[PDB]
Design a protein around this ligand. Structure first.
Ligand SMILES: Nc1ncnc2c1ncn2[C@@H]1O[C@H](COP(=O)(O)OP(=O)(O)OP(O)(O)=S)[C@@H](O)[C@H]1O
Ligand SMILES: Nc1ncnc2c1ncn2[C@@H]1O[C@H](COP(=O)(O)OP(=O)(O)OP(O)(O)=S)[C@@H](O)[C@H]1O
Ligand SMILES: Nc1ncnc2c1ncn2[C@@H]1O[C@H](COP(=O)(O)OP(=O)(O)OP(O)(O)=S)[C@@H](O)[C@H]1O
Ligand SMILES: Nc1ncnc2c1ncn2[C@@H]1O[C@H](COP(=O)(O)OP(=O)(O)OP(O)(O)=S)[C@@H](O)[C@H]1O
Ligand SMILES: Nc1ncnc2c1ncn2[C@@H]1O[C@H](COP(=O)(O)OP(=O)(O)OP(O)(O)=S)[C@@H](O)[C@H]1O
Ligand SMILES: [Mg+2]
Ligand SMILES: [Mg+2]
Ligand SMILES: [Mg+2]
Ligand SMILES: [Mg+2]
Lengths: 276, 456, 215, 64, 149, 74
């Protein structure tokens, strides 16, 4: 919707295309969604401007954004945005910065302007700003009921965001989206996507793979862990698919140019080998 | 005629007729922008902007070829491309007014000829060039002519030298039009190399195969992070060709390049083991657990996991987007885990000192994080850069040991998060260091004491 | 020779090698091979020798000069001249505008007309910013055009930290040199080195040096 | 006026002042106009009237 | 009333037209009021000399206001704010979100509010006596939110 | 050399420079600064810019050999 408003010309000239906080559990596609947006707008993930806020644990690191004061030894963000004014900016995992680094963001969000230590103004008015976070996720496991869902999770995360960030910052964001924890069906679709991307990475090595739905479902149930989202699926793929193929191709290269089929027989994975 | 200019500047048009200039491929959008700007009325001065090695000087050479080949609109069908090194202009102007007179003469000759397109490559040199205790610099002499359309002046400079030098002089900046030369894509780079190929075959006296072109582009794009695509892919093809020439020439005849001749060069540059797995290396990798148990007794599960990650990287199944492995080793004191990290480093490099080591017990204060990534711009020691970033950049295939992780301030590991997920860490200068080929081992003994002071 | 100004600014290492006064270079066959491979390149055929202080980089360039004299290099190099150029010598006596740019331009023309010269610039990090700043054009900017299209075959040596501090600040200059990593030799390699150098020290100190003294 | 009043209550949030009104204007007015104008340029040169019927906003297109 | 009092000629010559702290809850047009004043006085918002104090968090950033310290590289250039004011002495100056600046920045502002003069580090004195100085803040909003009854 | 004549009124000398180069070069020589009177050329408005472009139009049409519409100016 924000991208369409920008392309329709309805977007207020004096403001960025959008500013979004992506909030949720760990391992839920919010940084992946930011990269997917960058790809959909520019054809590659590399076109995203990225700022990994954990580098900014201490206030004075803000000089990376706007440069060193006049006459002091030695801005990165200002130069990159001035070079590509139509771009996606990702401030990943905002809560790990020093709380008041984002005081610099305020003028960006309200005006779409930021001033460079050379006295030069850069206009973020055509950028999209995305800020991933997972405040509250630690508190969600500190919490235990000495006593006898989604909306309560949403509310407590939003409250912890209210605690961590000053009110005049949160007031400038155009939208604050909480991400749903993944369902097991969604995890099975993610397994299908990952297996596709593995297959067509390996195919240009001339290693041809197929994985049956039974095998993918076994992987999806092996990697299931709700508190960790999709990441434990990667580890399951590494253990099951990649380890045994690596053993085969190292042990006499017995796979190059052949076809490998992975299926699970109900007891264990099997790695049948055949010609095309 | 232009008798001073002819002595000061190289004529690229005659050199293009001679034919020594290498061919330019695919850059039709940039050449079109250059033609559009040159056909302007008032400030027909394109400046080609981009990274080092992306091809800007090649764009100017391709424009000289296009003029010679009469592929240009009629207004350019008889134009001279003159490449004016400002060094040659400043050279020998010992006395007051000699530089100003020489450059004024050059401008007069350009005006009277009318058919010259000047090419001031390294345009950032033009600010202050020829200045002195009472001289007038080249920029202030050229400013009038650049703004009346009398000169047609192509320039080229890096983005950083543009910002640093000629965005200071805001009156000079106005007079040039930046043509952004982007880094070409993989497929564009393949086409570029195929077009250049004949020039390098004629030098090295070898056949350069198409799959070698594809290997060199893919590998140099994946593993050479300091340089930009066309230059570094040409570099990799040129060194692989030189290598196979040298090896065959000193004691069939139609020697040909191959993907392995390229892998050997890229492995020589980076130290990453990219050459084909021979049987000795494979037998060593398969017996890796046995080699690690020569120094670590027991701990079978850790040895297994480490060896499987090493095999998974050497096979080529590792996700390009992520480090080879990240491991936490957790357990009681005096039990193998640092010894296992050292055994792995020895098994991979023949020495324990090849391991990058970070003792987290000295990151007890949050602000110590500046050791990993450097001081912010403006603070003492900013020039020195990050110690971990420099060490990993200098040896991208290395074991990194983060020792005694629970003793560091809890926040300090937030710097690791991007390393573990993407395999990137950003140096405080803004340089990105790729950890994608490192193994990262973290060691801890949390809980292990509680497992003894638990008394039910 | 036909290069009358270069011969006054530089030292001809090839003749000094033919006079046998350069100490012998032992065991560095892989680095020498890499240097030969880079010099045989078509375009950016300039190696830069990178390493720690005292690992033996200048000794690599002298081993190359001796390889030239021994004609054991390929025919493409079999008669090259290695000229060590001190940048502090080039800037000597150049008070007036354009006098340094003129000197280095004439040097470059002489190199191009002779074609059989390999330039060696030890301590290459001095190259950037050499030649002053008050309306001068520094050596790096003068040489960048030539270094990228094969007219100059140039060998550099510098420490890792001076490379980082100086060369990589000018990434356009960085692109033009290929880093040849001069690793520290092993213990047994250093034993072989010292057993090779023995004769040169025995003659100077007029004493025998036992093997177990080397060990 | 009924549309303005509905926007003024959907955007009401007293701790954040006037800024949530902007988000409300964006969601209600600008989303649907951007859909209309991107879906076949059907707004250009015509008049649009926005009202609220007690269930939803309606976006009626007419000639001038 | 401050604008009208200054235009009537009754303003103390030694002082700026006005200095005002605008304080209160977020999203209440205290920045918009300064913008509207700038428009009413000059016909465009962009005539306002806007300073975003949230860049001045570290002590030494004050060099942007009055120039680099003596002997530092930029010392001859003078400050960016001083030169913008000297170039346009009749102007509205907005110090948005003052409380986010390092405390040391207000020591510079003191002489401006006291004598209507700012000494650039060059030693040149810039007269603010015809400017309007507006400072916005929302101190206490986090203290307001943790007021539980 | 010129300070005497500029202060006497011997030369009717128009000059032009940017704000930055005025501040950097000729405000240093405060005696020379005193001899010149600054005329600030402000940036023209949007509508003034439209008028300027409609005035220049003939010169660009005759160079490029095309017609330039008013709405293209706007
Ligand atoms: N909903 C999803 N759809 C598809 N892939 C997903 C999804 N969630 C996670 N993934 C995958 O899981 C991996 C990690 O996803 P991320 O988006 O980085 O998790 P994240 O929570 O956004 O990371 P943070 O914000 O830095 S903790 C990637 O390989 C994604 O492709
Ligand atoms: N489109 C192209 N077609 C053919 N060769 C190309 C093309 N683009 C780049 N090259 C080659 O890339 C190499 C380096 O390109 P250059 O244009 O010389 O570098 P550059 O961009 O001028 O870098 P600097 O820093 O400005 S000297 C040369 O060998 C060119 O032949
Ligand atoms: N399983 C083992 N096999 C062989 N040597 C071992 C083993 N465990 C410990 N050692 C030796 O004991 C010494 C100490 O081993 P370490 O690995 O440093 O202990 P540690 O577990 O690292 O202690 P912490 O956890 O870092 S406090 C070294 O000399 C090791 O060679
Ligand atoms: N491979 C070698 N063969 C023979 N002698 C060597 C070798 N390596 C080093 N040496 C000797 O050890 C010393 C090394 O000095 P250098 O070669 O100048 O080292 P360096 O790295 O060039 O130091 P800098 O950087 O120029 S200060 C000299 O006395 C050399 O003769
Ligand atoms: N009282 C008001 N009257 C009119 N418009 C207002 C009012 N308050 C806010 N607005 C509008 O809502 C937006 C935000 O107003 P601002 O004036 O920026 O809020 P602010 O509180 O002044 O900013 P702060 O204090 O730095 S968070 C602007 O588009 C204003 O036009
Ligand atoms: Mg994130
Ligand atoms: Mg060039
Ligand atoms: Mg040396
Ligand atoms: Mg404000």
């Amino acid at each position: 919707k924000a991208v369409r408003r920008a392309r329709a010309g309805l977007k207020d000239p004096k403001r960025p295309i959008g500013s979004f906080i992506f909030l949720g559990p760990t391992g839920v596609g919010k940084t992946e969604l930011a990269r997917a947006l960058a790809e959909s707008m520019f054809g590659d993930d590399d076109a995203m401007i990225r700022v990994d806020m954990s580098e900014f644990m201490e206030k004075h690191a803000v000089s990376r954004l706007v440069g060193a004061p006049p006459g002091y030894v030695g801005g990165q963000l200002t130069e990159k945005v001035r070079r590509k004014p139509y771009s996606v900016i990702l401030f990943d995992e905002i809560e790990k910065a020093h709380p008041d680094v984002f005081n610099i963001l305020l003028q960006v969000l309200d005006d779409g302007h930021l001033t460079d230590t050379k006295g030069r103004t850069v206009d973020f008015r055509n950028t999209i700003i995305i800020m991933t976070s997972n405040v509250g996720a630690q508190e969600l496991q500190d919490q235990r009921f000495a006593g006898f869902d989604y909306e309560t999770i949403r509310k407590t995360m939003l409250k912890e965001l209210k605690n961590s960030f000053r009110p005049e910052f949160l007031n400038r964001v155009d939208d604050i989206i909480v991400f749903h924890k993944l369902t097991k069906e969604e995890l099975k679709e993610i397994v299908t996507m990952m297996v596709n991307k593995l297959t067509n990475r390996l195919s240009e090595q001339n290693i041809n793979i197929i994985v049956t739905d039974k095998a993918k479902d076994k992987i999806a149930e092996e990697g299931y862990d709700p508190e960790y989202g999709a990441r434990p699926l990667i580890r399951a793929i590494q253990k099951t698919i990649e380890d045994n193929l690596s053993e085969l191709i190292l042990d006499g290269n017995q796979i190059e140019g052949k076809k490998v089929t992975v299926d699970h027989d109900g007891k264990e994975f099997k790695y049948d080998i055949a010609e095309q | 005629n232009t008798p001073t200019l002819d002595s000061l500047a190289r004529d690229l048009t005659v050199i293009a007729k001679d034919g020594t200039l290498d061919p330019v491929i695919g850059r039709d959008k940039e050449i079109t922008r250059v033609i559009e700007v040159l056909s302007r009325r008032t400030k027909n001065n394109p400046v080609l902007i981009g990274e080092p090695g992306v091809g800007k000087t090649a764009i100017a050479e391709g424009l000289a070829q296009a003029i010679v080949n009469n592929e240009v609109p009629e207004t350019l069908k008889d134009k001279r491309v003159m490449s004016l090194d400002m060094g040659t202009v400043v050279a020998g102007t010992k006395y007051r007014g000699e530089f100003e007179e020489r450059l004024k003469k050059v401008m007069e000759e350009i005006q009277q000829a009318g058919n010259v397109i000047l090419f001031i490559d390294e345009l950032h040199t033009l600010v202050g060039a020829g200045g002195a205790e009472g001289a007038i610099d080249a920029s202030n002499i050229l400013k009038p002519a650049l703004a009346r359309g009398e000169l047609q002046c192509i320039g080229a400079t890096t983005l950083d030298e543009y910002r640093k030098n000629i965005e200071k002089d805001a009156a000079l900046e106005r007079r040039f039009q930046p043509v952004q030369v982007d880094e070409p894509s993989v497929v564009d780079t393949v086409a570029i190399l195929k077009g250049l190929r004949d020039r390098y075959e004629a030098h090295h006296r070898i056949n350069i195969s198409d799959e070698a072109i594809e290997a060199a582009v893919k590998l140099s794009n994946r593993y050479v992070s300091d340089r930009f695509l066309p230059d570094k892919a040409i570099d990799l093809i040129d060194e692989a060709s030189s290598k196979v020439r040298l090896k065959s020439h000193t004691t069939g005849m139609s020697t040909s390049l191959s993907e392995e001749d390229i892998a050997e060069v890229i492995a020589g540059w980076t130290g990453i083991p990219l050459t084909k797995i021979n049987e000795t290396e494979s037998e060593k990798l398969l017996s890796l657990e046995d080699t690690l148990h020569e120094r670590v007794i027991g701990q079978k599960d850790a040895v297994n996991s480490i060896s499987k990650a090493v095999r998974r990287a050497r096979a080529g199944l590792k996700d390009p987007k992520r480090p080879i492995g990240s491991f936490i080793f957790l357990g009681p004191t005096g039990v193998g885990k640092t010894e296992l990290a050292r055994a792995l480093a020895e098994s991979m490099f023949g020495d324990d000192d090849a391991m990058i080591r970070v003792d987290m017990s000295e990151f007890m204060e949050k602000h110590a994080v500046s050791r990993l990534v450097g001081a912010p711009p403006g603070y003492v020691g900013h020039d020195d850069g990050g110690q971990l970033t420099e060490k990993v950049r200098r040896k991208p295939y290395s074991v990194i040991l983060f020792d005694e992780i629970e003793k560091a301030h809890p926040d300090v590991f937030n710097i690791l998060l991007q390393v573990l997920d993407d395999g990137h860490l950003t140096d405080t200068k803004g340089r990105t260091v790729d950890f994608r080929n490192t193994i990262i081992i973290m060691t801890s003994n949390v809980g292990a004491q509680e497992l003894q002071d638990q008394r039910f | 020779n036909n290069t009358p100004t270069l011969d006054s600014l530089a030292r001809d290492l090839t003749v000094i090698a033919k006079d046998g006064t350069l100490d012998p270079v032992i065991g560095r066959d892989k680095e020498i091979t890499r240097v030969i491979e880079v010099l045989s390149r078509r375009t950016k055929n300039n190696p830069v020798l990178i390493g720690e202080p005292g690992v033996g980089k200048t000794a690599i360039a002298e081993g190359l000069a001796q390889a030239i004299v021994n004609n054991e290099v390929p025919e493409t190099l079999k008669d090259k001249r290695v000229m060590s150029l001190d940048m502090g010598t080039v800037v000597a006596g150049t008070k007036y505008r354009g006098e340094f740019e003129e000197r280095l331009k004439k040097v470059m023309e002489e190199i191009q007309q002779a074609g059989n010269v390999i330039l060696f610039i030890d301590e290459l990090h001095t190259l950037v910013g050499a030649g002053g700043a008050e309306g001068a054009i520094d050596a790096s900017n003068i040489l960048k055009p030539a270094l990228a299209r094969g007219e100059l075959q140039c060998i550099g040596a510098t420490t890792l930290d001076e490379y980082r501090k100086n060369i990589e600040k000018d990434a356009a200059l960085e692109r033009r040199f290929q880093p040849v990593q001069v690793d520290e030799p092993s213990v047994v390699d250093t034993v072989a080195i010292l057993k090779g150098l023995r004769d040169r020290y025995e003659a100077h100190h007029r004493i025998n040096i036992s093997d177990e003294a080397i060990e």
